[PDB]
Structures are given as C-alpha cells and as structure tokens.
Design a protein around this motif. Structure first.
Motif, PDB file in Angstrom:
ATOM      1  N   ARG A   5       0.848  -1.170   0.000  1.00  0.00           N
ATOM      2  CA  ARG A   5       0.000   0.000   0.000  1.00  0.00           C
ATOM      3  C   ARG A   5       0.894   1.232   0.000  1.00  0.00           C
ATOM      4  O   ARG A   5       0.617   2.223  -0.675  1.00  0.00           O
ATOM      5  CB  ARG A   5      -0.956  -0.035   1.206  1.00  0.00           C
ATOM      6  N   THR A   6       1.992   1.118   0.740  1.00  0.00           N
ATOM      7  CA  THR A   6       2.997   2.163   0.844  1.00  0.00           C
ATOM      8  C   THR A   6       4.154   1.660   1.701  1.00  0.00           C
ATOM      9  O   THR A   6       4.045   1.605   2.925  1.00  0.00           O
ATOM     10  CB  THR A   6       2.411   3.449   1.438  1.00  0.00           C
ATOM     11  N   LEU A   7       5.245   1.262   1.042  1.00  0.00           N
ATOM     12  CA  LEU A   7       6.430   0.720   1.720  1.00  0.00           C
ATOM     13  C   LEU A   7       6.605   1.263   3.135  1.00  0.00           C
ATOM     14  O   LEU A   7       6.617   2.476   3.351  1.00  0.00           O
ATOM     15  CB  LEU A   7       7.690   1.016   0.911  1.00  0.00           C
ATOM     16  N   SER A   8       6.747   0.344   4.090  1.00  0.00           N
ATOM     17  CA  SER A   8       6.931   0.699   5.496  1.00  0.00           C
ATOM     18  C   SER A   8       6.045   1.873   5.895  1.00  0.00           C
ATOM     19  O   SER A   8       6.426   2.697   6.727  1.00  0.00           O
ATOM     20  CB  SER A   8       8.395   1.041   5.768  1.00  0.00           C
TER      21      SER A   8
END
Length: 10
Positions: A5-8
């Motif tokens: 969904r959104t890196l880290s």
C-alpha cells in the motif's frame, strides 16, 4: 494496511 500500500507506511 499493507507495505505494498505504501512501503513501510501502509
């Protein structure tokens, strides 16, 4: 949510 969904972020 998801790293994909959104890196880290989600």
């Amino acid at each position: 949510l998801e790293d994909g969904r959104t890196l880290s972020d989600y």
